[PDB]
């Protein structure tokens, strides 16, 4: 089986760590925190790693049921939430998973809309269902949040309207902010069983082991409730690459891949990358910022190479 | 290039109307209404058809600006925005398509969120919910501007990058005017919808749609509504990918227990791209979700399949 990436543009590519398109290829090589996420994370043979699954609708969405209302001390409302797995079956806490698939993977006020459909049926209405949706919030940061132990809290404001025991969706839109309060780190994993507890069965973090390479990321912007800010969220590999390489389950012949960045039309390369068999890119770039490139490209693979390959400059 | 269909289990795919799982296989044979779905349209060489676009993101999304608050009738706060292409691009109203690629293609309120980035260091944000009514006079996508209403708030800024999130409907009850298979009039009223990718329809007789049916959250009310789509997201990248020629007008495929190898039914996959089955009856297609179909070969106009 030989290996192929798929031939979409940025412009037909989407994040795998939060629902968003891929706005630009974008590299930091002053970044001081370790890169460890937990979505987006394939080998290049098709193994998915850490808290990856294949839908769009999965990434930083969860599924369950609400047991109870709490407040703060702050007056602030809160919901504790049971969560099962995407599909509906029950999580198994001894699952070899960070946490349930599909779990956000960074610390930060996650801002969405908790939607929900009762199981118990009215006659009156046709045997039909009620339902309900509000805006809400989720602080990954937070030590209510334990999805590796099967339950989360989430945040409402002005509304009594959320009924337990009965099936709940949470549909990601953005961030509530980016102050100082509200810890927004992309690369600051949560504790997803809670302070004092070990994450396990982790993604392994990523990095450039050669001197003057930098990590190459695919970067999107993303929602803000309100406040000031233009937060950012990149992956290792869009989405629409996770599923691929997962279908294609091509062995890997190295520990690297050397790939170019192609202008079709031209068919000139812009820029050649590596791609680890962990599934990440690195370049040979100094400077930190958009890589500027025609619309209609997308990477190419050459052949396999090993680590001592020198990529030219970009 | 031979045709291949995605291995993507059932659990594993996603709805091409609306950003949803693909929750169950679905029949309705005495489905009274011409299905003409303008999303998640493909041929199976795959030329996109319709407001069909590539991004999971793009269904059912706006991206553009607000002009102005409007007031009228109805309660809530209301709000024109024009809107461009996805990309950002302007609009060209000439473009061969319907209207911008992933406009919701069905009547109904849709139920989502509008959230703004400041265009003039760091720019202001704000969002909030809102409600796009596709029936509307005022829902005119292909003339570059629609309407959406918010809960009572003043807090949306005008001549500000604007965005919509697409979350469900608003409201399935009769003034709501929720019909998956009639399309909006995205030029408004009184005006006819152009460039349309074609209705499709079973020809042989004892045979009826497949689709890949999603169940669509509410923001109120009592309703379980449902979308249906003729090919799933993941299919209509793949298929748009292969660019493989059709070499009849239907091709034969299997769906497949793989742990079992058994098949446990076979479909007609039309070239226009969309799924047949010899079935009499309504509703699921009650099978493991870790089913997938796999073309088996290229046949005819009079090939007979087994019943379900």
Known sequence: KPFTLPILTLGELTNSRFPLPIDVLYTNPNES????????????????QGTTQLLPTGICAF?????????????????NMTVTNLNGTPFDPTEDVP?????????????????????????????????????????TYSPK???????????????????????????????????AN??????????????LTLNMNLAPSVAPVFPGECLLFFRSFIPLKGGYGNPAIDCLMPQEWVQHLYQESAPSLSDVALVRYVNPETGRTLFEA??????????????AGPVVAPTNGYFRFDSWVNQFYTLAPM
């Open 182 to 195: 509200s810890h927004f780190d992309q690369w600051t994993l949560p504790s997803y069983s809670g302070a």
């Open 145 to 179: 949040f334990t999805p590796k132990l099967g339950n989360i809290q989430f945040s409402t404001w002005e509304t009594q309207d959320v009924s337990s025991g009965q099936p709940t969706k949470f549909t990601p839109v953005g961030l509530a902010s980016v102050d």
């Open 274 to 287: 590596k791609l680890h068999r962990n599934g990440f890119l690195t370049v040979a770039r100094n400077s």
């Open 99 to 139: 946490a349930p698939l599909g779990t956000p993977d960074f610390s930060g006020q996650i801002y969405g809309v908790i939607s929900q459909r009762n199981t118990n049926t009215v006659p009156g209405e046709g045997n039909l269902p009620a339902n309900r949706a509000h805006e809400a919030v989720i602080a």
């Open 63 to 79: 599924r369950g049921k609400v047991t109870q209302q709490v407040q703060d001390e702050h007056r602030g409302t809160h919901w």
């Open 33 to 48: 925190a370790i890169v460890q996420c937990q979505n987006g994370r394939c080998t290049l043979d098709g193994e998915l």
